[PDB]
């Protein structure tokens, strides 16, 4: 209240903020205790929402994730203080405004998202809600940042039987069997994301389409990029590429640096 000046709302509950300390732009996320499904313990065994546990674990220094700067407990809620780049726009609004992205730009963005998801995995965190809505663009730096770990979990190599993520980005094995593994599920969602970037919208709206495993390109997409998307969207999890095989794919070579991407595509 006194440590930060609260501004107006952004999206639903996240508000614009300024840190009184040094006038740093922040985002102030409120989470209702009554609406929290999954709880964790901190390294000092304090009972907090899983979101805070996952945010603390990924808040190393690699800035492909929106870092948690601070948090507060209140009687009926938790307040998360997150970094706020300015100017910013989420990748969903960016794609709506600009339509199907050029392959060069899609390569830069998809690469940065891959580096951010690998970072999460390296820190033992599975995001479980990778989509254009959960990616912020710093328009000056040309840096993408992952947000909203509220559907996340600790990474494990054993099967998941729960999911609170976006259904249209969820894989066939979830729709059919209520069963998935983190990595192969994440690769599926990244297939949806890449299609979404180069085609201007997600390929599937209905369960029938998700489990169908037919990918129709509504926009001109190179054969190399079509192959990567088809491979990520393989029906059988074991047939999906590893993060290694994605980043070694011919389509992913000669990526633009963030600043190159800002200069050429965002300025």
């Amino acid at each position: 209240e006194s440590q930060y000046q609260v501004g107006p709302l952004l999206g639903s509950s996240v508000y614009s903020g300024i840190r009184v300390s040094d006038n740093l732009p922040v985002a102030i996320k409120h989470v209702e205790k009554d609406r929290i499904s999954d709880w964790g313990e901190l390294p000092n065994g304090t009972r907090v929402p899983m979101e805070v546990v996952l945010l603390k674990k990924v808040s190393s220094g690699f800035s492909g994730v929106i870092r948690l700067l601070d948090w507060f407990e209140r009687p009926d809620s938790f307040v998360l203080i997150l970094e706020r780049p300015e100017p910013v726009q989420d990748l969903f609004d960016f794609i709506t405004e600009r339509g199907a992205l050029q392959e060069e730009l899609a390569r830069s963005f998809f690469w940065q998202v891959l580096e951010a998801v690998r970072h999460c995995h390296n820190c033992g965190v599975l995001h479980r809600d990778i989509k254009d809505e959960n990616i912020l663009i710093d328009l000056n730096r040309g840096e993408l940042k992952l947000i909203d770990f509220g559907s996340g979990a600790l990474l494990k190599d054993t099967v998941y039987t729960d999911f609170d993520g976006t259904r249209v980005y969820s894989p066939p094995e979830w729709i059919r069997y209520h069963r998935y593994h983190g990595r192969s599920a994440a690769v599926w969602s990244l297939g949806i994301l890449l299609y979404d970037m180069v085609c201007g919208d997600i390929p599937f709206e209905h369960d029938e389409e998700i489990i169908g495993g037919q990918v129709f390109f509504r926009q001109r997409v190179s054969s190399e990029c079509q192959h990567l998307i088809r491979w990520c969207l393989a029906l059988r999890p074991s047939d999906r590429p590893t993060f290694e095989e994605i980043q070694n794919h011919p389509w992913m070579q000669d990526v633009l640096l963030p600043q190159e991407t800002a200069e050429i595509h965002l300025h």
């Binding site: 969903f92 794609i95 709506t96 809600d129 989509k131 809505e133 909203d148 509220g150 559907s151 609170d164 993520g165 976006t166 259904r167 249209v168 980005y169 201007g200 919208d201 509504r218």
Partner: peptide
């Protein structure tokens, strides 16, 4: 088609 957000 109609492009839209999808909730979590």
């Amino acid at each position: 088609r109609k492009r839209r957000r999808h909730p979590s």
